[PDB]
Amino acid sequence: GPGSMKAIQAQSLSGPEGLVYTDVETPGAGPNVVVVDVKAAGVCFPDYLMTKGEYQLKMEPPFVPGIETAGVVRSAPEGSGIKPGDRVMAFNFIGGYAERVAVAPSNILPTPPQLDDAEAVALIANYHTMYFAYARRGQLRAGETVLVLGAAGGIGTAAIQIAKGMGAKVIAVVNRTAATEFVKSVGADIVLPLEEGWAKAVREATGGAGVDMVVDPIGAFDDAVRTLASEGRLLVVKVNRLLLRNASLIGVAWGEFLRTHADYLYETQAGLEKLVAEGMRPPVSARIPLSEGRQALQDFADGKVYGKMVLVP
């Protein structure tokens, strides 16, 4: 028989309340799978949505949530170039909140040696998404100014550190004013609260010229457009007015892009490895035992997480 491992398993679509720490089948080696011993499992917004049956893909219980993992390879096929003992990052649609995960060889990336496993898992959804958003979709340039909305969340934090890494100036808006110092510490040049008149304050902070780019992981929207310079661009990571002027709304759908451009992943990993070499360290605000995954996910849903939270098996 296959043997069992601990995992958090959604046993209903009731959200975090339906999550149970329980025993499940241990994945098993196979000629086209890489099994990873999980040292850190990322908590992301899709995971949470999946627990409520509100994610674009509806998984039916029972299922182990978790898209993002980092740990140590246990097994891998010949010729994959992956070996037992390798420190790797992994992604899949499910299975992350577990002691081990089985994933396709194409879904494995080498962990940057400067990072621990929590910092490495933190790169997976949020940093690759934002590298892609900046490098491919929005064509960010050194010296431009970027407005980051929802700035203390997972995507926002990656959006700050990567923009700073690429030589941009960053204005961050926070809807949670208790995150102001956190956001400043991540490297935002100017932090502003999301209150009446914030769009006008963003403009004034740029000497009236507006920002070159807006990152919007929230959807507060027509106000965002108002902050844009001529030929500025807003990345949605929507009702559009006559205030669009010579601005662009830039759709960002990383998962979908990756489906048809799998080799771009080598470029996003290389870009991130360089940013990490140069000193970027993804902030990890909480590392919660896997056994306490229900409470971890509830805290995430209640809006308590700055940067990235991980579960530790």
TrEMBL record:
Transmembrane regions: none
SMART domains: PKS_ER
InterPro entries: ADH-like_C, ADH-like_N, ER, GroES-like_sf, NAD(P)-bd_dom_sf, Quin_OxRdtase/zeta-crystal_CS, Zn-ADH-like_protein
Record GO terms (molecular function): oxidoreductase activity; zinc ion binding
Domain Enoyl reductase (ER): 14-311
Stored CDD domains: QOR1 (cd08241)
Name under which the protein is recorded: Probable oxidoreductase
